[PDB]
């Protein structure tokens, strides 16, 4: 696990990103801009994990509720359907999670976020966008421990709610290993910030949490987050 090779991957994908790895409370940093680890960025779709948790915990929804698309034009055609909270998570389908947020309401959301202690724990006044254009901001270090805690079922929520949310996050299950995570991409701010926060379940049950953060750019493909992360984790011999 050479901190040089990984620098060269971020070097050569022309970006500015850091990869945070936490393995039972030791945090290692990789990339080409390690200073990113301690600066706050808007969380974007990575805040859906926390949004589900709050919603499920407060019984504003459940994993079987179907969210009806009422016909407004949305940003992707894949989002123009009825779907479950879990389907909306796989697609990062913002409008669904804005509905949920509006159900929670400002007060509940503000109390929950500051109770969890997530990022700056500031959501301002508009309860269905604070995680896309501020004011809510979080460092990649805080994100990896948040997701580390979730993987270990150690967040301040009931266990069944955390398990419900973990099951929406399954990204890939190959050769004995399991990968969980949530992509993010804040497109409507400068600079654009892209995320991929989650964890690896090693076949023996060891948990390795991770939080990819990079500066984003409109012409980049979606998979540049997965390509960067996959070959970084294979390098570190986490897979
Ligand atoms: C906010 O919309 C943001 C969450 O950070 C979205 C934008 C990108 S792109 C997203 C659109 N739908 C997914 C997909 O591949 N399709 C077309 C179903 C991907 C994003 C992300 O994936 O990080 N989340």
SS (H, E, C) 131-163: HHHCCCCECHHHHHHHHHHHHCCCCCCCHHHHH
Residues with a CB atom less than 6 Å from ligand 1: 44-45, 76, 78, 91-92, 94, 183-185, 222
Atom of ligand 1 nearest to the CA of 225: 23
Question: What is the rounded distance in angstroms from the CA atom of residue 54 to the CA atom of residue 203?
Answer: 30
- Are 181 and 198 within 8 A, CB to CB? yes
**Centroid of ligand 1 to alpha carbon of 13 (angstroms):** 20
Extract long-range pairs of 26-35: CB within 8 Å, 24+ residues apart.
27/141, 27/144, 27/145, 30/3, 30/6, 30/232, 30/236, 31/6, 31/7, 31/214, 32/7
Picking from 74, 126, 77, the residue whose alpha carbon sits closest to that of residue 105 is 126
- Are 196 and 226 within 8 A, CB to CB? yes
Q: CA 13, 25, 120: angle at the middle one, nearest 5?
A: 70
- 45 in active site: yes
Distance, CA of 229 to chain centre: 14
Atom of ligand 1 nearest to the CA of 185: 5
Q: Whose CA is nearest to atom 14 of ligand 1?
A: 91
H-type helices in the chain, by residue range? 3-12, 47-57, 85-90, 94-116, 130-133, 140-151, 159-168, 224-235
Question: What is the rounded distance in angstroms from the CA atom of residue 120 to the CA atom of residue 113?
Answer: 9
**Centroid of ligand 1 to alpha carbon of 184 (angstroms):** 7
Atom of ligand 1 nearest to the CA of 44: 5
Give the mutation target among 47, 97, 185 for probing the ligand 1 site: most ligand atoms within 8 A of CB: 185
Q: What is the resolution of this structure in A?
A: 2.7
**Centroid of ligand 1 to alpha carbon of 61 (angstroms):** 22
**Centroid of ligand 1 to alpha carbon of 127 (angstroms):** 20
- Of 16, 35, 45, 218, the active-site residue reads 45
- Are 173 and 123 within 8 A, CB to CB? no
Picking from 62, 151, 146, the residue whose alpha carbon sits closest to that of residue 100 is 62
Q: Whose CA is nearest to atom 18 of ligand 1?
A: 91
**Tokens standing for 66?**
């179907």
Question: What is the rounded distance in angstroms from the CA atom of residue 175 to the CA atom of residue 172?
Answer: 10
Residue 140: exposed, middle, or buried by beta-carbon count in 10 A (0-12, 13-18, 19+)? buried
Atom of ligand 1 nearest to the CA of 195: 23
Sketch out the chain's domains with CATH numbers: 1-239 (3.40.710.10)
Residue 4: exposed, middle, or buried by beta-carbon count in 10 A (0-12, 13-18, 19+)? exposed
Distance, CA of 236 to chain centre: 21
Residue 69 DSSP label: P
Q: Whose CA is nearest to atom 16 of ligand 1?
A: 91
**Centroid of ligand 1 to alpha carbon of 185 (angstroms):** 7
DSSP-derived 3-state class of residue 50:
helix
Token pair 């796989």 is found at 90
């Amino acid at each position: 696990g050479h901190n040089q090779v990984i620098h060269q991957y971020f070097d050569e994908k022309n970006t500015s990103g850091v990869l945070v790895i936490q393995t039972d409370k030791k945090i290692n940093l990789y990339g080409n801009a390690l200073s990113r680890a301690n600066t706050e960025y808007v969380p974007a779709s990575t805040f859906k994990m926390l949004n589900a948790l709050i919603g499920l915990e407060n019984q504003k929804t459940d994993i079987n509720e179907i969210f009806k698309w009422k016909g407004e034009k949305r940003s992707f055609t894949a989002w123009e359907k009825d779907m479950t909270l879990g389907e909306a998570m796989k697609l990062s389908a913002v409008p669904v999670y804005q509905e949920l947020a509006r159900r929670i309401g400002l007060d509940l959301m503000q109390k929950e976020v500051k109770r969890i202690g997530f990022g700056n724990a500031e959501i301002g006044q508009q309860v269905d966008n604070f995680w896309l254009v501020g004011p809510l901001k979080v460092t990649p270090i805080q994100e990896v421990e948040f997701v580390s805690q979730l993987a270990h079922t150690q967040l301040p929520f009931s266990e069944k709610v955390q398990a419900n949310v973990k099951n929406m996050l399954l990204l890939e299950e190959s050769n004995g290993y399991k990968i969980f995570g949530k992509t993010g991409w804040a497109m409507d701010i400068k600079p654009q910030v892209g995320w991929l926060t989650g964890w690896v379940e090693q076949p023996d049950g060891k948990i390795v949490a991770f939080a990819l953060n990079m500066e984003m750019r409109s012409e980049m493909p979606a998979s540049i987050r997965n390509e960067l992360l996959m070959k970084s984790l294979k390098q570190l011999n986490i897979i």
